[PDB]
RNA sequence: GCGAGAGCUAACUUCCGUAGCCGAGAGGGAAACAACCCAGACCAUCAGCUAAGGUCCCUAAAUGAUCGCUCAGUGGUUAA
RNA sequence: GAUGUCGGCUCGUCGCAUCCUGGGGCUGAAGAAGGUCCCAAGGGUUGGGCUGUUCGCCCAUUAAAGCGGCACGCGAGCUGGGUUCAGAACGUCGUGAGACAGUUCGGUCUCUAUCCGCUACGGGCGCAGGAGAAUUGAGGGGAGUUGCUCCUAGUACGAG
RNA sequence: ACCGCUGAAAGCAUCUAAGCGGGAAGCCAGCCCCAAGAUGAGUUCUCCCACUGUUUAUCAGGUAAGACUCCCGGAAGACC
């Protein structure tokens, strides 16, 4: 079971209706949920209430809240993944907020940031996606950490910084 | 991957977990990577 | 999309360069416009060109207030393509220019009754270890008890050709404005004096 | 000695499929057209009022309008003739969704397909209002 | 169907014992269908109550009432 | 009071427990080449020699050179090599007439399609006037294969 | 098939039960051909236009636009 809510002062819900609606520093974001899922804020923190307890019910409602909770450092904070390039001429330029890939392929690989992401590059060997929603940063730095996984004999491609790739080790 | 009609652990990982109708078999190594389906 | 009517005319020898090509001469003669169709009159976009021409005294009272309705003047052949426009008459100066691909669609020569052996191949059979069934005839139908029929499309004699027919991406390699002519590389379908209708690529490469 | 025929009527109802579960609807429409409450009440000939339906693209399925419900359609010798399709997949012609369930709660014979001609279907709303200069007493389902 | 031999505790298999049915049995049910289920047709009737079975629409009759079970389309083809 | 039999040839079509091409997991997978399990039948799957063969062995190739079903698919479609007529021979059995797990040479496989089905092509009528012509597309059919060289790159990889 | 993002029920973990994405010679669209007897028989442009016949010959009969018949041909075709 799941209940503390930091709402920090940013923030401005606005649970009108079942579009669970809000607005902070970052851009307002909305985030629904189930009506019968019951919440709003109480004194000063919030809480996230439930009708029934044991699966159907206790699921969602682990859910909602983990869920508000995150457009709370959502709009409050914004969230940034950090990817690095590795291997030999593994490289990353740029092209306006276009990640630019450069990872062994006969051709060179173009990446697109959709509606509400931006790439960032430090040394072309690290990448970095950060952003509004906590979502499609990761399910976007999925797209590049897909661009090439790492292997079984080097680990090399995108990965996680601290990624734990251990070696199959050959010939 | 590994379609096996007994699917069971095979060591202190093996996480047996069940995605659309299936019931399946992530372990922290591959070889023990089941799947009834 | 764009088009324009011609006449088949004939193939023929011709080098660009040292590479002998032979070409299928065609005339597109000047095309008129006779009807713009829109999606908001006949619920779709589209026109209406016309072609070999026509004495008013063969043309039927209706036909000349159709032809009439955009004073143009008999033609006797008429035809749509679809998404085109232009303002005037469709002629095949800037329309088609030499070196792109086209694809040419007459009416397959009419080859009458044929057999299978030269409308779907087959191989008929024997010739001398014995017979009845020398060369052509097909062999079988179908199975047995099963399917206690034969099915829909089984390949048998037939009226082969007089098809509607499309030859695609041809090279057209000359074009004589000043004379509706075009040449076109390669072998366009029916025979000479028959209508053949050039298209922009449906979709090459 | 039991009662005769009509005729010199044709009430022309107007059904909403809106939300509606397709067969639960289905049924009703296949009720009305076939004879409802009936006037003679009559097998020999059909006196069961017209109908019509508007919306139909938005009628309502459950656990499968992806998996399941797949309307299948064997066409010419079935040399592999195996055609089928989601009903989901039938955002092209919700219209038929309907149309095409009914037309099985209807008598098959002779009789029964000149009923399927009192069934009219429209995919909209008050567009499909247009298709309508008769009656229209709106007796939605339940 | 029940009780056995046979046979792979195989077959609309084969041979006995035993009860029922078809054979010589129409009618309702089981989509369809000898024998399964209900029931034994003297004739006439725009009359009525019931069996087995049933009561969303194709068919006659509660999309009935109340407390639950499963989201599989299980229901609408088996097992370790 | 007859459901023509083995094998070919012709003509196909269907299942998948996929032979090759497509996608994927794991590999004891370095790369290249493979093993193996999953998903997947669009399409494709060669020519010769021996045998009546099916089968199979083999020559040369191939991406491959799948397995099965359809009265061991198909004789009112062809053959007829095979085997279950009459002749004749050998071995074998029989005193014999004859016989056979057998072997061997020979030996007339029926012009005319009525119903369904199928491929083409017309006549009627219908589509709320009588006509000329140009079209929308409901639906339906066809096609849907693969190698090799080059480039990237002699890179990644690899002690090489 | 297979890989995944956000992620509860199992304060962790999880491709998942809410949700979202990638992904095959295959499926649907796309290409070429047929096609409203798609009897739910569609659409568009154009033409001919409102004749005659007394409950004795109740509907046919002149005709318009148009077309067939027929003649001479054809790269169309068995005949049509």
Known sequence: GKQPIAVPS??????????????????????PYNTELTVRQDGDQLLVERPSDAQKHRALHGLTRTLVANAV??????????????????????????????????????????????????????????????????????????????????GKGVRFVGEQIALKAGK | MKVRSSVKKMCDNCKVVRRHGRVLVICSNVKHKQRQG | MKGILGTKIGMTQIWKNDRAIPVTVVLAGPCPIVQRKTAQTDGYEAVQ????????????????????????????????????????????????????????????????????????????????????????????????????????????????????????????????????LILVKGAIPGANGGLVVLRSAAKAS | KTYIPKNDEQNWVVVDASGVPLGRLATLIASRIRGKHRPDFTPNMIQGDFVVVINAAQVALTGKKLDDKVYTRY?????????????????????????????????????????????????????????????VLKTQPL
């Open chain 1, 10 to 31: 940013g923030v401005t819900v606005n649970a009108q209706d079942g579009v669970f609606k809000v607005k902070g520093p970052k851009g307002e974001l909305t985030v």
């Open chain 1, 73 to 154: 450092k959502g709009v409050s904070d914004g969230y940034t993944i950090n990817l690095e390039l590795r291997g030999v001429g593994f490289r990353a330029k740029l092209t306006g907020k276009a990640l630019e890939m450069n990872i062994g392929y006969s051709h060179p690989v173009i990446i697109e940031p959709p509606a509400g992401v931006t790439f960032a590059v430090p040394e072309p060997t690290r990448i970095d996606v950060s952003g509004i929603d906590k979502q499609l940063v990761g399910q976007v730095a999925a797209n590049v950490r897909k661009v090439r996984k790492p292997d079984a004999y080097h």
């Open chain 3, 49 to 180: 060109i016309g072609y070999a021409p026509k004495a008013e005294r063969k043309v039927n009272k209706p036909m000349q207030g159709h032809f009439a309705k955009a004073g143009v003047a008999p033609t006797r052949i008429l035809r749509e393509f679809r998404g085109f426009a232009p303002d005037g008459d469709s002629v095949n100066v800037d329309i088609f220019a030499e070196g792109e691909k086209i694809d040419a669609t007459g009416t397959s020569k009419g080859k009458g009754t044929q057999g299978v052996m030269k409308r779907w191949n087959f191989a008929g059979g024997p010739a001398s270890h014995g017979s009845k069934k020398w060369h052509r005839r097909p062999g079988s139908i179908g199975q047995r008890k099963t399917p206690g029929r034969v099915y829909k499309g089984k390949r048998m004699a037939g009226h082969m050709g007089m098809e509607r027919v499309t030859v695609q991406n041809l090279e057209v390699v000359e074009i004589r404005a000043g004379e509706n």
């Open chain 4, 75 to 135: 066409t010419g010798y079935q040399g592999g003739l195996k055609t089928e399709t989601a009903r989901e997949a039938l955002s092209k012609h919700p219209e038929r969704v309907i149309e095409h369930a009914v037309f099985g709660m209807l008598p098959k014979g002779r009789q029964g397909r000149a009923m399927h001609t009192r069934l009219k279907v429209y995919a909209g709303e008050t567009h499909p209002h247009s298709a309508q200069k008769p009656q």
